[PDB]
Enzyme design. Sequence first.
Site, PDB file in Angstrom:
ATOM      1  N   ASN A  13       0.827  -1.206   0.000  1.00  0.00           N
ATOM      2  CA  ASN A  13       0.000   0.000   0.000  1.00  0.00           C
ATOM      3  C   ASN A  13       0.864   1.260   0.000  1.00  0.00           C
ATOM      4  O   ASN A  13       0.517   2.251  -0.650  1.00  0.00           O
ATOM      5  CB  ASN A  13      -0.955   0.009   1.190  1.00  0.00           C
ATOM      6  CG  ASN A  13      -2.191  -0.840   0.949  1.00  0.00           C
ATOM      7  OD1 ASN A  13      -3.013  -0.522   0.098  1.00  0.00           O
ATOM      8  ND2 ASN A  13      -2.331  -1.914   1.705  1.00  0.00           N
ATOM      9  N   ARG A  64       2.327   3.252  25.454  1.00  0.00           N
ATOM     10  CA  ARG A  64       1.862   3.643  24.127  1.00  0.00           C
ATOM     11  C   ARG A  64       1.936   5.152  23.940  1.00  0.00           C
ATOM     12  O   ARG A  64       2.420   5.640  22.911  1.00  0.00           O
ATOM     13  CB  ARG A  64       0.435   3.151  23.902  1.00  0.00           C
ATOM     14  CG  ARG A  64       0.343   1.849  23.136  1.00  0.00           C
ATOM     15  CD  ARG A  64      -1.106   1.450  22.924  1.00  0.00           C
ATOM     16  NE  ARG A  64      -1.342   0.048  23.258  1.00  0.00           N
ATOM     17  CZ  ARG A  64      -1.246  -0.956  22.391  1.00  0.00           C
ATOM     18  NH1 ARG A  64      -0.916  -0.722  21.125  1.00  0.00           N
ATOM     19  NH2 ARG A  64      -1.481  -2.199  22.789  1.00  0.00           N
ATOM     20  N   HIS A 108      -8.327  -1.048   5.852  1.00  0.00           N
ATOM     21  CA  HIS A 108      -8.679  -2.271   6.570  1.00  0.00           C
ATOM     22  C   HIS A 108      -9.240  -3.297   5.581  1.00  0.00           C
ATOM     23  O   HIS A 108     -10.152  -2.971   4.801  1.00  0.00           O
ATOM     24  CB  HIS A 108      -9.685  -1.971   7.688  1.00  0.00           C
ATOM     25  CG  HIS A 108     -10.135  -3.179   8.453  1.00  0.00           C
ATOM     26  ND1 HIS A 108      -9.352  -3.799   9.403  1.00  0.00           N
ATOM     27  CD2 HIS A 108     -11.299  -3.872   8.417  1.00  0.00           C
ATOM     28  CE1 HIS A 108     -10.009  -4.826   9.913  1.00  0.00           C
ATOM     29  NE2 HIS A 108     -11.193  -4.894   9.330  1.00  0.00           N
ATOM     30  N   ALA A 140     -10.690   6.404  14.434  1.00  0.00           N
ATOM     31  CA  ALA A 140     -11.328   6.837  15.666  1.00  0.00           C
ATOM     32  C   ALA A 140     -10.748   6.056  16.844  1.00  0.00           C
ATOM     33  O   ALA A 140      -9.857   5.216  16.688  1.00  0.00           O
ATOM     34  CB  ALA A 140     -12.846   6.668  15.578  1.00  0.00           C
ATOM     35  N   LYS A 170      -5.902  -6.958  -1.826  1.00  0.00           N
ATOM     36  CA  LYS A 170      -4.879  -5.922  -1.892  1.00  0.00           C
ATOM     37  C   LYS A 170      -4.902  -5.183  -3.220  1.00  0.00           C
ATOM     38  O   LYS A 170      -4.566  -3.998  -3.266  1.00  0.00           O
ATOM     39  CB  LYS A 170      -3.496  -6.517  -1.652  1.00  0.00           C
ATOM     40  CG  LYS A 170      -3.097  -6.525  -0.193  1.00  0.00           C
ATOM     41  CD  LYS A 170      -1.665  -6.975  -0.023  1.00  0.00           C
ATOM     42  CE  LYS A 170      -1.296  -7.047   1.446  1.00  0.00           C
ATOM     43  NZ  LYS A 170       0.146  -7.357   1.623  1.00  0.00           N
TER      44      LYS A 170
END
Length: 200
Positions: A13, A64, A108, A140, A170
């Site tokens: 991608n 994180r 996704h 989100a 893909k």
Amino acid sequence: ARVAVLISGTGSNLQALIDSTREPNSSAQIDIVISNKAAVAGLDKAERAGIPTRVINHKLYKNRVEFDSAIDLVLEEFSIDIVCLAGFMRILSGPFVQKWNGKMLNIHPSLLPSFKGSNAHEQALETGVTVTGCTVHFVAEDVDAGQIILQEAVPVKRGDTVATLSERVKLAEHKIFPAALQLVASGTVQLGENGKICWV
Ligand SMILES: Nc1nc2sc(CCCCc3ccc(C(=O)N[C@@H](CCC(=O)O)C(=O)O)nc3)cc2c(=O)[nH]1
Ligand SMILES: NCC(=O)N[C@@H]1O[C@H](COP(=O)([O-])[O-])[C@@H](O)[C@H]1O
């Protein structure tokens, strides 16, 4: 619009985004590629394209928010407007997602809201759908729960495996991800104050 691509793997991608954003009519420029893994094909594609690269290892940060903070620092240094997650396999913190609300896209490999989460092809195959697809969406706080920008349906074929289905999906991803980035970077698509998606 100045774009950062965050990667974790082979970066097919990424390559699609590089190809489209180099077209003369592209409203986006990829100014930096960021990876959480330091020996991935994606980094090489970026270097081959003359794009700066940075590797951020979670093994140097306590949490994180600290790690995403390191990402955010690089985004600010490169005056980035838009973040594309392109096979980026970490979960982002709330504050980081909050800060980039409406400016971070993700690809996704399912037709959301179906098959949220990490193994979308395995989910699709166990469920028996004959149609799956991919979705570009704004990120989100609920994983795979932001506003949908583009989708494309892809057939499931008898005997498909994760290998063959991901390969077919893909090809679809390589079409809608560049299109979606172009729609956001040109301001044709935006997240409105109401959190709904606006076509301008
Ligand atoms: N804040 C925020 N961060 C992020 S990062 C991103 C790109 C994908 C990252 C890799 C990833 C994405 C999702 C999952 C996951 O949920 N796995 C579940 C499966 C759930 C089920 O099976 O239904 C499990 O482990 O069980 N694991 C890794 C999207 C996104 C986002 O939307 N919001
Ligand atoms: N939502 C998380 C997720 O499952 N991402 C998936 O990881 C792959 C990365 O491929 P690439 O490295 O060839 O771009 C993509 O196929 C994307 O659908």
